[PDB]
């Protein structure tokens, strides 16, 4: 059996949406077509089983409602659901202050399930090298 893993890099978007966008570029991972990055916004797995799923988000803001990042799951035939969430209060630094969140855990996925990351303010996400990323590996 092949190893199944993905690591994708953050991508900015002028688009109007809380869903973060990603790209297969730089020092990324995509071991085979058994995980795919779909529509720049979700990692989709072909095979059922246990996966370790993670995301890290750096954002730069000034401010208060927290900045919240959510790892979400869409399974075939099911409504979307939140798997993990992390918060950080906004910095007072000018012009903005950077803060980071890391999320990760083990979850059972169904064939064709997709995971994605949502945030309170996508325009505040830091996209400099290494700051923001999303991945998974099959156990």
């Amino acid at each position: 059996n092949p190893q199944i893993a993905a690591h994708v890099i953050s991508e900015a978007s002028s688009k109007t949406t809380s869903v973060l966008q990603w790209a297969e570029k730089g020092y990324y991972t995509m071991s085979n077509n058994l995980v795919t990055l779909e529509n720049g916004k979700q990692l989709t797995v072909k095979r059922q089983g246990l996966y370790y799923i993670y995301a890290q988000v750096t954002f730069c803001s000034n401010r208060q409602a927290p900045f919240i990042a959510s790892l979400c799951l869409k399974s075939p035939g099911r409504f979307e659901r939140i798997l993990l969430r992390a918060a950080n209060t906004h910095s007072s630094a000018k012009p903005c202050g950077q803060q980071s969140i890391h999320l990760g855990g083990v979850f059972e996925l169904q064939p064709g399930a997709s995971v994605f990351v949502n945030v309170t303010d996508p325009s505040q996400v830091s996209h400099g090298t290494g700051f923001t990323s999303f991945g998974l590996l099959k156990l």
Partner: antibody, heavy 117, light 112 residues
Framework: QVQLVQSGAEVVKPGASVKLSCKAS????????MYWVKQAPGGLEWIGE????????NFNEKFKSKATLTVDKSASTAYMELSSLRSEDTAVYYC???????????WGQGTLVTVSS | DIVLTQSPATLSVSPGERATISCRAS??????????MHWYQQKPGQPPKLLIK???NLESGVPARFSGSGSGTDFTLTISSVEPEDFATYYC?????X???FGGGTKLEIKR
């Protein structure tokens, strides 16, 4: 439509600083990264970027000590300050809007900076 | 940093002739769905103008005679039939990683 208007030419002595401006109109200034790009009398080089929404920046390692990037959102203007100027900083300097931090889809007219004793 | 090498340095063509220019990267800039390579036109005294994005997508408002192709380390831009306003210098640019870098340019010159 989309337009980027840059400030006028600078002629300065070595050790001076200049602060260049880039006024944007015709789109939502906060929705696109702004890049700055150098073209020396002799080749295109990317200097860095600013997110206008929050003032976050990233730089080419080659320019990190040289360039300071800011914005005034209220005025839809991005600025680049160049310090410790030496003759090798003589160039045309562009601001350019980036779509998704990939391609550079609209460009300012460029600002000539000439540094000389 | 990624190095982009364009060929030829100067391409001499007439109006009404096909022009193809190439751009070779020091590493691959393509993955599963996209190639992160873009092309620009620049004339003296003017800023660059985007022509082709992600290897093969014609930028809005750019005429249909411009096309792009390639993958991995090797990309080409083609003008199917040169027109007098096309004589200019052309640059390729990647967006694979920080920093984006440009090729040294290909000058499209009037053949006589």
């Amino acid at each position: 439509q989309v337009q980027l208007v840059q400030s006028g030419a600078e002629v300065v002595k070595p050790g001076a600083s200049v602060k260049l401006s880039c006024k944007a109109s015709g789109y939502i200034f906060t929705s696109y990264y702004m890049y700055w790009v150098k073209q020396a009398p002799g080749g295109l080089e990317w200097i860095g970027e600013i997110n206008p929404s929050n003032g976050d920046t990233n730089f080419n390692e080659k320019f990190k000590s040289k360039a300071t990037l800011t914005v005034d959102k209220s005025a839809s203007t991005a600025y680049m300050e160049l310090s410790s100027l030496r003759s090798e900083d003589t160039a045309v300097y562009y601001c350019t809007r980036s779509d998704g931090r990939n391609d550079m889809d609209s460009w300012g007219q460029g600002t000539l900076v000439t540094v000389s004793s | 940093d990624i190095v982009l090498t364009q060929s030829p340095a100067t391409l001499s063509v007439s109006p009404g002739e096909r022009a193809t220019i190439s751009c070779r990267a020091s590493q691959r800039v393509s993955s599963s769905t996209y190639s992160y390579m873009h092309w620009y036109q620049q004339k003296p005294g003017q800023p660059p103008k985007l022509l082709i994005k992600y290897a093969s997508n014609l930028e809005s408002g750019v005429p249909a005679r411009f096309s792009g192709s390639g993958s991995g380390t090797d990309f080409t831009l083609t003008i199917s039939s040169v027109e007098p306003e096309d004589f200019a210098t052309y640059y390729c640019q990647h967006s694979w990683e920080x920093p984006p870098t440009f090729g040294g340019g290909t000058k499209l010159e009037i053949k006589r």
